[PDB]
Amino acid sequence: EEEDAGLVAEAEAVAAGWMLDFLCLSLCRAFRDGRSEDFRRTRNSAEAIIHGLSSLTACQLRTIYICQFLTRIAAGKTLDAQFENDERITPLESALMIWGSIEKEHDKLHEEIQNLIKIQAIAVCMENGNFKEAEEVFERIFGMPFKSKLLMIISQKDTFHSFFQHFSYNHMMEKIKSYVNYVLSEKSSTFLMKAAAKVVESKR
Amino acid sequence: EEEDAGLVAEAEAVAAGWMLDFLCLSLCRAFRDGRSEDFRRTRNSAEAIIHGLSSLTACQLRTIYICQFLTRIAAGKTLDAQFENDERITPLESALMIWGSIEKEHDKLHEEIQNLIKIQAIAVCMENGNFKEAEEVFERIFGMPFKSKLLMIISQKDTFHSFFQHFSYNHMMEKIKSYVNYVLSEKSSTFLMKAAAKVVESKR
Ligand SMILES: CCNC(=O)Nc1cc(C)on1
Ligand SMILES: CCNC(=O)Nc1cc(C)on1
């Protein structure tokens, strides 16, 4: 009776792990497709399953990081959203912190995404008229040539500067979607999705 | 590409259906064991998965009703909780409405649970000093001998009446747990639980 309760709890943890991978895959897919409402509802389902999980494997932690990363990128223009205990950290700064924590390859795409997030973390502050906040995000991020141009743009209050059009929010989203495509191909073979795809195929 | 999106959405619906049955089973188990915190977190996970489901089978609707029923029974003493658009309906009245809607056998246990919920819907109002609310719940529920004693108890403001000890809140919970045991045996063979149990067993 006591050992049965233990086996049940172990079975619940296995199922929660399969649910986390499936929800990450659905979240990645909605982000790639720009299905905003499906992304919001999938994010709510992922947050709840995560609260029901205790011990995490390195793989499950990377899966959660990916979910948290896309959540912050989707809210990158919502400066009112507080993702950290320190209320001064903006959503793109929180996404940058997670991007540098994921156990992943630091290839060319990784650094390009990192640098696009840094430029946009400042740019979103400038477009909202938050010039003093843009300087504060700058000090938190850069602590030379790229750094020098950004400080010049902040001091000139050049909200719609041409530099922000070359390294745009759209460009950041497109590069992030390329990475999301790689995560989609890696997680398409997870237990729940494979089994659900086989039922659908068998009905055709 | 368009047909692939359709097949993916169909696979997501199959997986959401398997997740709903698993979460109902975990919710039933936590309610039976009195694991209050596990019940709260499982209820949050079940509500999110339900919002991601559109077309529902008669079986999936009964599964949701069961989840909603246990949620209202668990909050039966929280008179501040509003489970209906009409703010006057108390949690036990909302549980009674769902109990009479489930496509299930109306056996002796069914009517005993129904009658225990009616007595307790009034009793919880009396114990909180809400005597006028107790009369209003009475009018909503009974619209003779059982009805007559209850009206007499309400008019006498007999909060700790002996009748409420014979047909107690504990007695209602115990009878509801007997029904929950039947739901547990029926849903233990659902896809996610069976597959998760087999992985646990194979590791022993
Ligand atoms: C800081 C509170 N918000 C979040 O952590 N959001 C998340 C996390 C995951 C996962 O998805 N949204
Ligand atoms: C009225 C809003 N609250 C609920 O419907 N609660 C539920 C529903 C399910 C399922 O679990 N809790």
CA of B70 to the centre of ligand 2 (A): 9
**Which residue of chain A comes nearest to B19, CA vs CA?**
A19
Q: Do B51 and A41 touch (CB under 8 A)?
A: yes
Q: Do A15 and B7 touch (CB under 8 A)?
A: no
CB atoms within 10 A of CB B198: 12
Tokens standing for residue A189: 């073979």
Q: Is the CB of B135 under 6 A from ligand 2?
A: no
Technique employed here was X-ray
> Which residues make Cβ contacts (< 8 Å) with residue A13, sequence separation at least 6?
A53, A54, A55
Q: Is B161 helix (H, G, I), strand (E, B) or coil?
A: coil
Q: Do A41 and B19 touch (CB under 8 A)?
A: no
Tokens standing for residue B30: 């936590």
Using alpha carbons, select from B17, B73, B13 the residue that is nearest to residue B43: B73
Resolution (in Å) of the shown entry?
2.2
Tokens standing for residue B70: 């246990």
Helix (H) or strand (E) holding A50: helix A36-51
Encoded amino acid at A128, one letter: N
Distance of CA A140 to the CA centre of its chain: 20
Smallest Cα distance from A99 to chain B, Å: 27
Cα distances (Å, whole numbers) of residue A10 to A53, A59, B121: 11, 18, 37
* Angle value at C-alpha B82, between B78 and B87, nearest 5 degrees: 125
Q: What is the DSSP string of A149-182?
A: HHHHHHHTT-TT-THHHHT-HHHHHHHHHHHHHH
Distance of CA B115 to the CA centre of its chain: 15
For chain B, list the domains and their CATH numbers.
Answer: 2-195 (1.25.40.210)
CA of A48 to the centre of ligand 2 (A): 14
Q: Is the CB of B83 under 6 A from ligand 2?
A: yes
Helix (H) or strand (E) holding A71: helix A58-74
What are the backbone angles phi and psi of residue A160, rounded to the nearest 5°? -95, 50
Please report how many Cα atoms fall inside a 13 Å half-sphere around the Cα of residue B8, on the Cβ side: 16
Helix (H) or strand (E) holding A45: helix A36-51
- Chain position carrying tokens 């039966």: B76
- The residue numbers preceding gaps of C to N over 2.5 A in chain B are 143
Q: What is the DSSP string of B42-70?
A: HHHHHHHHHHT--S--HHHHHHHHHHHHH
Please report how many Cα atoms fall inside a 13 Å half-sphere around the Cα of residue B191, on the Cβ side: 15
Q: For A12, which DSSP code?
A: H
Q: Is A74 helix (H, G, I), strand (E, B) or coil?
A: helix
State the closest ligand 1 atom to the C-alpha of A67, by its place in the atom list counted from 1. Answer: 10
Instruction: Name the burial class of residue B9, with classes exposed (0-12), middle (13-18) and buried (19+) by CB atoms within 10 angstroms of its CB.
Output: middle
Q: Do B10 and A200 touch (CB under 8 A)?
A: yes
Cβ proximity of B188 and B25 under 8 Å: yes
What are the chain A neighbours of B51 within 8 Å (beta carbons)? 41, 44-45
Helices (H), chain B: 2-33, 36-51, 58-74, 91-99, 108-127, 131-141, 145-155, 163-166, 169-187, 191-202
Q: Is A190 helix (H, G, I), strand (E, B) or coil?
A: coil
Give the integer Cα–Cα distance in Å for B14 and A50. 21
Cβ proximity of B83 and B112 under 8 Å: no
Give the integer Cα–Cα distance in Å for B16 and B22. 10
Pocket-testing residue among A23, A47, A94, ligand 1, by greatest number of atoms within 8 A of Cβ? A47
Number of residues that make up chain A: 204
What are the chain A neighbours of B189 within 8 Å (beta carbons)? none
What are the backbone angles phi and psi of residue A158, rounded to the nearest 5°? -80, 75
CA dihedral of B88, B94, B96, B102, whole degrees rounded to 10:
150
CB atoms within 10 A of CB A135: 16
Start-to-end CA distance of chain B, whole Å, equals: 44
Best of A23, A37, A40, A200 to disrupt the B interface (most B CBs within 10 Å) is A200
